């Protein structure tokens, strides 16, 4: 056909872990750098 399409790369990024010291607690929270949470 005669359509116009755009190509943008699949989302990627570096997951990093945020944590208080194990001397205090154990629960952590992750951060997905440069990611829209509609995908995650």
């Amino acid at each position: 056909t005669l359509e116009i399409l755009d190509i943008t790369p699949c989302s990627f990024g570096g997951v990093s872990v945020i944590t208080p010291g194990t001397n205090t607690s154990n629960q952590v929270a992750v951060l997905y750098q440069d990611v829209n949470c509609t995908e995650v």
Binding site: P9, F12, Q33
Partner: peptide, 23 residues
């Protein structure tokens, strides 16, 4: 700010910790 005028292959740019408002 007005005077100065200026991610596909595995390269990324991270935002600064301090925004321009804080500066």
């Amino acid at each position: 700010f007005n005077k100065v005028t200026l991610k596909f292959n595995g390269l990324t740019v991270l935002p600064p910790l301090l925004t321009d408002e804080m500066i």
